[model samples]
Target chain A: RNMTPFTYFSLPMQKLFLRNQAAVRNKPYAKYFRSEMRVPLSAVRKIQQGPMALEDTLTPSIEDINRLLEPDFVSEESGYALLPGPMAYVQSRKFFPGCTAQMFKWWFIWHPAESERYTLWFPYAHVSNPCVHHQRLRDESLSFEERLYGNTFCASEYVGDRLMHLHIDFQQPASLGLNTDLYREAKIDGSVSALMSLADHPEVPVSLMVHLFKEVPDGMYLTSRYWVGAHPSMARFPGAEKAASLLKENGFGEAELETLAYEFAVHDMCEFNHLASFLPDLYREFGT
Target chain B: RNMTPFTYFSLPMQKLFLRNQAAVRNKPYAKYFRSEMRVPLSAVRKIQQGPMALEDTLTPSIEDINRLLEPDFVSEESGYALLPGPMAYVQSRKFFPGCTAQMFKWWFIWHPAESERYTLWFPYAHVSNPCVHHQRLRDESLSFEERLYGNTFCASEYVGDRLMHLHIDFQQPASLGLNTDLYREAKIDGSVSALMSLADHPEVPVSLMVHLFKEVPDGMYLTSRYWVGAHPSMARFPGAEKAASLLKENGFGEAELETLAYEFAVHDMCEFNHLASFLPDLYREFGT
Candidate 1:
């Protein structure tokens, strides 16, 4: 009573599905979530929402995550598909033949800066035991950019409900990173946080920018604006657009922050690249 | 504009998510998408509504699949998660892994048994290209149980939209076994399918059952069921389940299907044990 076989489908339908689903790395996914970003001019403050707003330390259940999945978020048939934002530790990190975490077809990860090594983290969850199957992540290294830049990681959305939350905390980065791998052999690092420490990208520290991804045909060309900066406190800095002066006055190293701005630009690209590729498919991601 | 870290969460919130998700795997997941289930002595067939009805091949599109997913067909969990009823090959034919017109996972296939070496296949998709991945599933040698049981696979519901429909052909034996390499090296052949090639199973030639986990303060119990037996149609024998009776009727053996059924029972246990132990945490699987 089903519609079609898994392998054999009618001409155009199945073939197109395969072509679209094939390895997407060779394609220009790099254009989607690029890293280099300039802070936006008209920034929005994080004001409290109305009464019914839910807040507090939050954790979604497996049922919560399993209740989700994704496909072509690129909106455009020719748009980029999900590609790794693995913040380049100078443009490369080698994976064994078939690769870890997964093979060629998966989200690849990397930690660009030391701050991110400890500061940012993504939670992990799934419905099966990896030990029983001998599947564990293997990790290896980085340098000055990785040291000066914020933590850049590639958390591939896994096959099962592997839920690693997008957690950013200036204080607990170290403890959180190692602690996450407690139940496993190697580090279970997943998910990516844009940057490590705001000090890394001082010049363009506080900027607001909007992202646009064409939706499924006539749908919305989704948009998201970021009030980017290292306000770990999530507090409003003294001056919104005058972040450079604020950093200089606040002892954040005006030129030093400027030095890291290029890193942030790279950071911006990776973020939006993954988004435009197939993230918009989530629809919920664009936060209507 | 986000409030929480991706991974480590506040005290009870994350902990509770794990517990709830864990137990879901242990619940009666078998009931979600059961097959060959003799419509409880008293069954309820759909009587239709008044205004209108929409039915077709219904092969959902990426946008459509993105709008949905699965865990249990509870249709109740609050609702049904997509499930697959991949068929067995003992009574089935042909699929060659990496030998497809295009080589990839959309449905990379194989069939060594001459009977099933041709009549079978699965679609392989995902925007093409992976020759460089060096990921070909090389396989060989297993007891007749594993080898003849068919290349049993467990395409766990991934966190991304990856769908492959189930298919069963009831006319072959000793020639079907899917050999998909789960890891970079070896293989992890897993799954159980109801025999649809028999009057007992009827109509639906195949079915699937998933294993779930239950996490409680003082408990760690698990359970699931599997209907087994191969009534091969590799042809000469008309029925997979019926062959058992015919064995005596002709001169093959008194109860060969029963013997194979025991092998299948053993098969069922191994498949689920792994599912219960560490399945609820792909949290680490999908890396960012």
Candidate 2:
């Protein structure tokens, strides 16, 4: 169903699996192409090796090669140091009353400003038990924070399969409030080019930043994820249109594009992994 | 504890267990007590033929005795009837947008509305199975109707256990609008109350008149059910004062009272059954 060349170029094989496979596993021909096809390394090596031999034949020095790669480089006495991943500020609220308050219950992921890939862990309590009939599903006797932290804990290492970035917004400010700040922070840091908000947020005269990602994870075939949120205004950002145009140019499909148009509806319908998986992939594909 | 003098007038047993047992055994307490107590003929003969001879001296007609026992009686011809027990109404909705046009599906139920005295059956799909994970409990997909019905049904039944009169205003008209009237015509009858809008429809309402039953069925309870629509103007309804009066007059103890109050919170935080079962017993004994 995804017919565009841009989509094939932008989305990595792994991401395509995550979005499509969950919904398409039972469809025809899905079983045959069940997993993402990896790009052949031999082809990549051959293409690069020929260029390296040509440079060697021309007798270019290593410094010249470095300068060629860094064409906008400025000479400096001291070198710049690479910084760690962007910082994430995490917070959680208990929606259910009589629920214990949560401490150390936060979503963790690499910040958008960071170039490296990272995973976020969102541990939730499976409060219901099958065998028990009379017992309450969630214990009300526990304090709110106690219940919040009781069922969730961070793992020591990224399992690769579980990597994700978190983004959240509310339907209406008077209704559900924005609970995640990752996207907003990313926009402020120039990691993302556009603000993500419900289409009805405002009528703006200027362009805004926009980034869109679509991918399928391993062991999956077809997936589509969409999200939406409300914002006060879109007036200040002049790069939003360019960002949206870039997202379209990069081959994000109609389903993903609609996330920016109808975030409220999508927010009501989309699941956690469906939204999170899009972020890392979009950043990887579109980040300058 | 139920320390009131009226406690002595209660049935002095768990009415639910008693009724189920009676249905199973096919014998009422009148038969069981006669066999179990086994009073001697001498005691019976004393009332019939002893020196006092009250039965011989005076003969009261059956009508007189019936009138004395049921003094508040109105004419059966008046068509007024008492709700035999508690009742409930439940509903669900699912939204889909993948089609050419947006689609919505809804399910509804109007059931017996009793508090402690009735058991309700809600058919639900298993959304999350608890057997698959130890920590996760089975999660049933409960629609807004299901949750509201559960709370109201349980509350009414609990009140019925104490022989309290319960009148529930099903807040549905705002949601389903005229469709609810059509639903009643097909299933229940035109006589269903709280149908101000249906009654205004000339053709449809007239057709409903033929289906009206003279009385609600034996052991069946009636409720005025409606679906409140999405409009803010449609949200007007009775305040909590009436609910508080009902709870207090019905002999609900502090815990049950709190449960009822919790239902009024902005968020639906109470577990359906837990809120129902929190009510204290109406008839606990004090000192000898």
Candidate 3:
């Protein structure tokens, strides 16, 4: 008798973060910011247990789904599927202290159909923030002051044919702004200028979320929630068991393990709830 | 005023010899026998003088002459100049049957007066042997079936306050046939077979001859006649200027120059004579 070998697929879980302009300027204070997260296996299991009957639920038109899954939304092009879940807001601020926080909300998906892998996606989401100054402000954001009122939103559908969407609105207080117009203009212009400087540096923060769907087998996918270096920490939904084992074997103590687990949880919470708790503090002594 | 630096003095003529048994065997029919001869400049001109005066012409005390010329003969100890000269038999087979013929000769001299310079002592002589086996039969008429015979002789006398010496010699020969009875007896007495077999190999020939004399400021030494290899074209004598020059420029064409020279003139000859001939032959065969 002939027999075929059974193959199992596992998804990637670790997220990589590069310190951006805002994080570099704050020096010692920036250490307080948590820019990295790890999704645990248990969370991945939870995500895989038919979180929602995506296929039976609000049947999304092909065009709508395609619009939501544009290649620019992910770090790598192609090979990605949107996992069924509510969108959550991920935010950061420091370079533009007075500007409203930048936000992103995404769901997870995976690779092959017969594989237990996944990635995240966001549909019809407008990611907005202010220009450094009024004169330099593009139509996306009119004035430097307007950046302090940036906002973002994501539309999603789930089981029971229910259509739902998520959105985030944030603002910076006057205390975070510079007093002089030129200083403010410089701050606004320079923040973007500094970000543009990184164009030569071309840094991309990659967050990989793999969700295993029980009925869909296993698969893997990738996505970028926002601009490459804009975010401080790239968080994946549901930590990876393999990564946890590796970290454990590589001399990482209990404290590090717990921190990793907690970071992943926080990331998932913020992404799903559209809440400010996950927004990185731009002006806080440590956040900068 | 400036002065030239002092330099060390060197003997003008340095002689070298190519001595090998294989060379003898390879040039079995060489015309002249040649040897390498070296002399210092200090003795060059002086040696040109007539032979040393003979004390008591009748039954001359050869001992006194030998003692006075001790430096010219081979000694068990040191003191004499380290000069090389080949002693060969012009018609060695005549005196010693089943033997090879050879010659002894000189090249140039270095004198103390001009110790730094070497002067070529060009000389030549010739001899021819019309009779063959008879020469041997005559020398060994008393012996039981000709075996071996050798002789060495020299003539010198004082002439007008100068000394002169002339040398002549025949090489030794090996006669295994004469010693066959001795070997047969040993074998019958249970001697090793190896010892009996050794008698079959070719035997080496040996001979020695030398002449010495004192010299005045200027004088001349003439050669009456001399015997070398088998034919007249093989030998050379002293004061044969033209022949010496010819040897210096071109050796016995296509023949082993040293062996041929040695066979012709049973005396040590110059390296130039050997080289001029050998070099061209070597080039012809080995060079591009």
Candidate 4:
């Protein structure tokens, strides 16, 4: 919005630890009010590894649950949600600006609730620069556009009170055909179908750039991001059938297809549960 | 010293206002235990115009005097004591980093005493990147040495019983030099006398880089960093005579010479007394 990230709420995930410290003084970190956590690359890595439930390792502390539900816990401040990185900690792809390559990318998802006061934490409970770099402002992208790094700034739609539909259209931005660009040069073949089918969906196009937020714990932080678009992998999820078809026709092996399928059907919700797991006390009182 | 001003301390004087709030948590404002005081460029623009002494505006409560003196006042943490814009509030020659040309450098002078323990609050205290740059690992002037800046790797010398002489030399690879490639273009003549006569001083040279510290009192803050080295004007003082001869020979026209003369024989001491004019307590205890 503003030229420099100083006033706008942009993401620079790496500084979380520093901000958490400053928060003790009640000072918000950076241009943002808070810098809370990093979502791991574990979920995506699990896909490359073979079959294993992405939901097993997370444990919700009843103590955390109580804290989360206390209502008093949620402050007027907010933090970001992200997963794009090299990213499994040891490795990395392109890093955003003001950062080193081989550095993991920390993303920012929108959470209007946190921006607000007294809004329900559960809805947001799930969610979480400098330099004038921007889409139209800068000559070239700052580093990689959010879409190129597997992050579709996908659009969102609400149904029955929950965010049930995520529309990612590749053809939207001229820069990235459809939703994102073809820079997945490495995963070119594998990411193609998911890349292309995004825009031309039965329900219309998949809109990238949806607002998002994440839970604060690192362990559970993983899927909270993937949860943003709900489950994009499940056949039952609104866009899953379309994305699954795109994956199948594009030559994804069974493992990838199944995982993508699982994503739509369960991971989105599972991850939400994972985040919610930390606040079992709140879950008992207000969870769906 | 380790390159990059990250941990040693940084200049974000703006935050001092914010921190003074937290000092209420029992920390002293002048000492690490305290973050109290507002810096006034009064010295630069005698707001009073011509009559009132700049010192009287500074009122030190007896309570502040006791607190400024107690040995228990010093804490491990510290604050800087210099103007850092392209900046001293009233005017500035240069700013270090993250600062624009118009920016007044908000700097801190090292007062191990103020830091280790608040020596005598009234009198004692004190106080990146990019754009590829380098310095001789050991010593040699870098191009445009001032940023005309850098050779930032300067060193400090402590003399006196309580860090009395803070000698900053432009020659030491460890510090800057009189060798700074001519950036003070306007005062080229005046500064040259101050700058050039440096390395050749009988004591070694009137290293313009020498520094020192002070205190402020928004309420009870009392640090005035005439660390700009008051005695640099005093010929009888360490490096003063050399600087004096340089100015007189260089055609400094009288008023300037008298002021420089006043600084050393008086300013360093005057500013100290001037600084003491505020905290009659510490100055009463230590002034000569």
All models: lDDT?
A: 0.22, 0.20, 0.21, 0.24
Chain A only: list TM-scores of all candidates: 0.22, 0.21, 0.23, 0.22
Best-performing candidate as measured by TM-score: 4
Of candidate 2 chain B, the 10-residue stretch with the lowest lDDT total is B1-10
Which residue window of length 10 is worst by lDDT in model 4 chain B?
A: B1-10
The Cα error of candidate 1 at residue A68, in Å, is 34
Expressed as tens digits, the lDDT of each residue in B69-179 for candidate 4 is 233333111111212110011111111222211111111111222222222221212220111122232122422234223222221211111112222322321132222
Candidate 3, lDDT over the whole model: 0.21
How many clashing residue pairs are found in candidate 4?
82
lDDT, candidate 3, B85-164, per-residue tens: 21112111001111111111111100111211112111111111111233442342444112112222232221111122
Chain B TM-score, model 2, reads 0.22
User: Model 1 chain B: which ten-residue window has the lowest total lDDT?
Assistant: B42-51
Alpha carbon deviation, residue A15, candidate 2 (Å): 27
Taking all chains together, each candidate's TM-score versus the true structure is 0.18, 0.19, 0.16, 0.21
Docking class of 2: incorrect
**Model 2 Cα shift for residue B32 (angstroms):** 40
Kindly list the per-residue Cα lDDT of model 2 for residues A51-134, writing each as its tens digit.
112222111112221231232422211111101111000111101111111111111111211112111111110111111111
